[PDB]
């Protein structure tokens, strides 16, 4: 029930160069759920691309 | 050369550790956090709490 987040900023070719930034402990989630990724592009314009 | 800096590194030395500035003390880094602290509009403020 801790949701630990590690970030690799993409300044290096190293895949595992992960940095902890934030987490929420005692996290309550549905026991079963759907994973999904959503992205929006409003007034400004960013390309949202997921490779893997 | 690891793109980590400007970083903020906690290193506690008992008196027996040489600080490797060439690796910026990455090996003996007890902790590190990634924030920039240069050229800010207002002065940067730091709270350091030793507590238990």
From Swiss-Prot, chain A:
Q: Which disease is it linked to?
A: Factor V and factor VIII combined deficiency 1: A blood coagulation disorder characterized by bleeding symptoms similar to those in hemophilia or parahemophilia, that are caused by single deficiency of FV or FVIII, respectively. The most common symptoms are epistaxis, menorrhagia, and excessive bleeding during or after trauma. Plasma levels of coagulation factors V and VIII are in the range of 5 to 30% of normal.
Q: Its biological function?
A: Mannose-specific lectin. May recognize sugar residues of glycoproteins, glycolipids, or glycosylphosphatidyl inositol anchors and may be involved in the sorting or recycling of proteins, lipids, or both. The LMAN1-MCFD2 complex forms a specific cargo receptor for the ER-to-Golgi transport of selected proteins.
Highest classification ranks of the organism: Eukaryota, Metazoa, Chordata, Craniata, Vertebrata
Q: Where in the cell is it found?
A: Endoplasmic reticulum-Golgi intermediate compartment membrane; Golgi apparatus membrane; Endoplasmic reticulum membrane
Q: Write down the species.
A: Homo sapiens (Human)
- Name the positions where a carbohydrate binds: 42-44
User: Subunit structure, per the record?
Assistant: Exists both as a covalent disulfide-linked homohexamer, and a complex of three disulfide-linked dimers non-covalently kept together. Interacts with MCFD2. May interact with TMEM115. Interacts with RAB3GAP1 and RAB3GAP2. Interacts with UBXN6. Interacts with SERPINA1/alpha1-antitrypsin. Interacts with BET1.
Q: What is this protein called?
A: Protein ERGIC-53
- What PTMs does it carry? The N-terminal may be partly blocked.
- Tissue-by-tissue expression: Ubiquitous.
Q: According to the record, which residues of the full protein are present here?
A: 210 to 261 of 510
């Amino acid at each position: 029930n801790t949701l630990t987040v590690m970030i690799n900023n993409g300044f290096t070719p190293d895949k595992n160069d992960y940095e902890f930034c934030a987490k929420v402990e005692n996290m309550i989630i549905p026991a079963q759920g759907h994973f999904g990724i959503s992205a929006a592009t409003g007034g400004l314009a960013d390309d949202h691309d997921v490779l893997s | 050369g690891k793109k980590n800096n400007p970083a903020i590194v906690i290193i506690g030395n008992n008196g027996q550790i040489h600080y490797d500035h060439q690796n910026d003390g990455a090996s003996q880094a007890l902790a590190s956090c990634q924030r920039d602290f240069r050229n800010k509009p207002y002065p940067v403020r730091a709270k350091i709490t030793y507590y238990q």
